[model samples]
Target chain A: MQDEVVLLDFWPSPFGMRVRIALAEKGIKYEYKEEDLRNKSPLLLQMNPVHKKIPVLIHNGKPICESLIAVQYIEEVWNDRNPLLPSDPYQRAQTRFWADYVDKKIYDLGRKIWTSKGEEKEAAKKEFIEALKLLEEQLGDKTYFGGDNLGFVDIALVPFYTWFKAYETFGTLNIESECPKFIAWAKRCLQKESVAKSLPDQQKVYEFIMDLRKKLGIE
Target chain B: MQDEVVLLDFWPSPFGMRVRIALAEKGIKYEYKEEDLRNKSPLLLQMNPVHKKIPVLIHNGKPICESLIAVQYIEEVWNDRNPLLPSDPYQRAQTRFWADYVDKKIYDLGRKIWTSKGEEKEAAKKEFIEALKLLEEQLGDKTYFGGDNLGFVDIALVPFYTWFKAYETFGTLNIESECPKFIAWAKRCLQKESVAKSLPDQQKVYEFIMDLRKKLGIE
Candidate 1:
């Protein structure tokens, strides 16, 4: 069996960045292969046959797919290092709830805003803002989603913040204005070396979104 | 702290039924309070302030919201009794994958079909059938979602079958014809005494759905 771990990823993908952050946070050295999304690597296909999506982390030849699942797997396999989740069951459940909420509400709403146009886009934008508002409310008086320490929920939401400035410019909206606390929290998360080092350039993200908007004919 | 557990639920909700089945399967007796969804119980709201929706399993004054979370809690707290998940990590992941898939795909698609009309209803019907087809494909030749025995996924899905016949009658869609293997698998799940005894009658479910449809003006 090969001793090295391999991460199949695409540079701009928030999902792929999640795996990168987890691996880096745990201080586990892994081989990173940046896959071309248009022409997927055979290894990527083999690793995640079901989703066939990026951010598949292969440990000792076994693959773990899904960003959150990959994070959990990394936490389990390297428990002695920085813990991603709390040891208490209730705290773990709370973390899972926040993680799940981000996936369902924030990510889903963000996709709607990204792909939608006209009235649909407006409604999606409203929903996305509302979701962020709820998240901010939940994060009240806490340093992080896990109450002081960066945990699973913090890891889950921080990547999306990388694109927030682009969304503000393109959509003529500001999430930071509405959710200043969360924005501050995002800034704090970005200060972490693992997150800061792994994230792609913000300007690159903006250019990508501009191209995406042009393709979608969104202004 | 209260000695007994209290389950705040609605009779027709598959999510609530998941918790009911888990408790019954483990032979853990609990007090059941049926909630009127139109007018949710204050207790349920207080327990799950975030969601304020049912299938809130309160044990010793601690509330566990989300059916899957409650199911996991039941498994953890009553570890000595019936184990819902496999002890092995990979197997547990597999079980969780199916359970999570059911929650997202099957449950959500079913809701669309239940509440929609015209082209939207037709689209939901197609999606629902496709979701069932995926489930059938996943089942392959396995006796249960977990190898040979019933586990987390099985319990999570079995209760939704209570409304399968109702969908057939109202929507004129035959689930058994479209996915014979899945229907058979569902029947096998119902064959368990714990599952069979706990399941509500199909007639009651039909009536409840009709009432709900009228209330929502879905027709």
Candidate 2:
């Protein structure tokens, strides 16, 4: 029997993108439903009642809410090809830790840097740089966070690569200059077909961010 | 050969208590090292360089940071033992979603309920109840979040049960009346030696919260 898969997602969400990259890597054919977040679809609300958020993966009529959890579900159900997480228990735990770090530290601080004003913005940018520096040290000449193969952390973080230009533009920062190795790693990630196909153009993301800033009256 | 396991934790932390519960459930004997968070030990820093937080499960000298990740690691390694998570992929994702909810919404609002003043405190209590109400609905008629057993969601949320008195005293709200079934589930969880032994007494937790209030000049 064939599995019916559908993704309720917003184009720009890093969370949603993580699931997309995983689905691509696993070679799973899925229906991609782009959500109008302002007026959320009934499917999105019904699928994820508690959070009412996107990146809900409906597999054979059962909805899997939360992006990371969905990615893990994809990996587990489609275990035959392209294992995103490491098999070893200890290594898998480490992979989850870093992916969680990206979710908590990177995304929040990056948002703060781009959205905050004056002294708050400066502080956020500094803290954001510090976080990236720590992550770069983790990367430390390795091809990926899990070392050779593009694994969990790579999928979890690579989407944010598209947002870097937007973050730099709004925050008045030079991420490339500060985290050169990190940028190099991101380009390395882009070299993969799965990532290249899954991620949107950086310039488009940047323009979207510009529109959002105007809408929110941030500038 | 037996695996060597050590846990770096603080007694009052719900996160740390989760590791203890999982360990006790698996009947994995571990050396428990208490940390004074204000004056953190070098070992804690070495084990968890990124978060520098407690409830680090060091198995055979490698550290697994984050409570949920460590619990998952335990389930994998001791697969033949008492299973903490469900075996079905969709069910596992569902369990993780609720556990992540506990981490994201429950802990924060629970903290705010205890620490904030007047209107802010009142608002946090309202929101906290709303979160719990949603969870109670999820609980439904189940004896535990895992149905017959005390599973991931049970472990994730049961630790917070001990601090309910502290929350009510400071926030001035009744949790038992608001969600009696949730409290009943907690009691059912307490029936197991694993949960009972791992959780600190509610009165002790309340005293600790009182001290925290005084220390933070919230009283």
Candidate 3:
């Protein structure tokens, strides 16, 4: 598929999933290569020497690293359909703020919850819930984070919801119950064929995380 | 100064200093209000209701929040004079990458070194040193983060060198010896008239951190 772009990724990574969802939402075709993190491919190392992390999008033989940056790159390169970022500068800044906030807070909270024990686990859980609550408040009554439609923030945050079931199994954490509006917003996003098709199933993610936690002796 | 801007800030904050340096570099005239963090001014909160943190640049009565965002806003609004961001898209992306990198890695490393103890502190110290080493490698032979010019990344990072000194005093760490290039880069940045005049002295920052650590019982 010469016309298609190539996405080098690991399936379980939310970052990679972000790029995948963005591409699918844009209705762009792409090939996927599943990376072996244990023995990372030369292309992956060559492409992303800094982080050397997954979810590198190779478009026209050029590698774009960092999932959010890759999404922005995709938006810039493919501007004709479904703009991921807003046109207005102020609105764009707001999108960036939320995207960056999620990138830092949620990912850190995830790491804490995924790895910690005892009080550290409890504190991380509290912070994780509070973060979601603040996100809900920030969201308010907007139809989407981008306002009236899905945009960059939506793409950036939606992948984290994939682990809700895992959290539920481990800690009886119910994201839908705790943050009903956020859950509804996530589901609403899924109604779009692109998001629905590209998003990994919650159960599948739960199973994957369970296996991962078991391997790490965290569960 | 009707034609000038207003910067709302708290002196102790590195974030606030970032904006101050940007303004000084551009030779922009501005009124400054040193905000009290314990009892934040209503004006400060009103200017940035979302995050309500320091370093709000109010230009023509509109507020720009977040230190780096404010700096970029200044650059764009004052495009005629000194440039903070590079004009080329790829170079702009590179600047954004390093800026974001510093924001993420440094903040996390700082938190670890500040609050953590024993092995955790040691590990965090190692990571912080490694982060600086990465910056040194990336910055090899360049006059600044943006090659020959002092661009956004340089502006974003220079203020944090003050924090590095704090780490040495409070955490009993010596980053300068481990990362000579970074230390030289910091000196180079301070040699700039704008940066030199804007930032607080290293002794002042070190003493501030000493008091801060005493207050927090980290010392």
Candidate 4:
């Protein structure tokens, strides 16, 4: 049976980018329907009525919501090449643990950096630096989080690199100066065609955030 | 090789109960270490330095933190017997999606039920009901979330049933009255020896919450 895969996404979403990278890595051809979150498409609303969020991966008419889960689905269905998760049970657990960490730490703290003010912003900045440094330590001298190849943790985290500039600009922080090794690792990840093609331009993402901040009256 | 499994857990934690239930379902024998959450064991801290949280599953000296991650590890390692996750990719994705939903909705709102005051408490109660109803609708007439067997979603959700009475008493909300079908499903789950044996008694959980509220000066 020919697999019909479709992705409901927003270009600037790090979550959506994870799915894109996974799909690219797996060498699967999928339809990408960009969603305007302000005025969401009925298809997206029907597909993911619970969250009404994008990055919904519809495979053979069944919708899979949530980016990490969708990425896992992509890995499972397209098991022929570019395995994201490791085979060893313990190693797989460790990979999942770190990926879950990225989900919990990076997204929430990153959002707070752009949206919050005063002490809240300061706390978010401090926590974000700590989080990034912890992630850096996790990477250590390894070529990738999966070591010698881009894998689950890499897919989970590298998408946020596209937004680092926006976060640093709007939040008035310096990520490269704070976590240089992490930036170096991200740069290495970007060198991969799968990752490079999946991500939007950093400057374009920064501009989008700038426009969003204006709309949010944060500028 | 003989497996060395140890669980670092607190008595009343829904998260800990999940690991316990998964282990029982797999029929894996292990040591259980009860951690004093206020003054956490050095072993717990060492095993899970980043989170410093309980429900750490140490398999042959390696640590797997987070309840859902630990449950997955159990399923993977003991694939010989019961299967928590399905073999099919789409079914697996749907199971994980709902489990993730339970993780996101239940724990956070349930916390607010016992911890917050006035409008916050009201809001949490309102949301918790909606969450439970959604879960009930998903269950429908299925024997279990796994349909005819205890699966990942069942393991993810059944642990929370032990805490329901505590949540109701502390929040002054009648959960059974609001979502009877969900309550009925939980009762059906409890009929299984694995689940029944794994969960702490409901009244004990209630008393623990009562003590906790007093310590926090809520009462």
Winning candidate number (DockQ): 2
Instruction: Give the lDDT ranking, best first.
Output: 4, 2, 3, 1
| DockQ pick, better of 1 and 4 | 4
> What's the candidate order when arranged by decreasing TM-score?
2, 4, 1, 3
What TM-score number comes out for model 2?
0.96
lDDT of 4: 0.90
Q: Candidate 2: how many backbone clashes?
A: 0
Error of 1 at B64 (Å): 2.0
TM-score of chain A by itself in each prediction: 0.92, 0.95, 0.93, 0.95
lDDT tens digits by residue: candidate 4, A105-159: 8988888887789888889899999999889999988999989999999999999
lDDT by residue (tens digit), candidate 1, A1-219:
336799998787888888888888888888999998778988888888766788888888788777887787778778799888988776677777778778767655665676777898899888788778888888888887767777898888888887776767666678877888878888888888888988887789878877677654455
Supply the TM-score for candidate 3.
Answer: 0.87
Candidate 4: pairs in clash:
none
Q: What TM-score does chain B alone reach in each candidate, compared with the true chain B?
A: 0.91, 0.96, 0.94, 0.95
- Model 1 gets an lDDT of 0.80
- How big is the positional error of residue A54 in model 3, measured in Å on the Cα after superposition? 2.1
For model 1 the local lDDT of residue B5 reads 91
- Evaluate every candidate with DockQ and list the scores: 0.37, 0.93, 0.33, 0.91
Worst 10 residues of 1 chain B by lDDT: B210-219
Across A84-131, the per-residue lDDT of candidate 2 in tens digits comes to: 898888888888988899989877787788668989889999989998
Clashes of each: 0, 0, 0, 0
How do the residues B65-129 of candidate 3 rate in per-residue lDDT, one tens digit apiece?
Answer: 88887887778667789888876554566677788788778866775787888888889888888
Per-candidate TM-scores read 0.88, 0.96, 0.87, 0.96
Off by over 4 Å in 3: A1-4, A110-127, A215-219, B1-5, B42-52, B59-63, B110-122, B171-177, B215-219
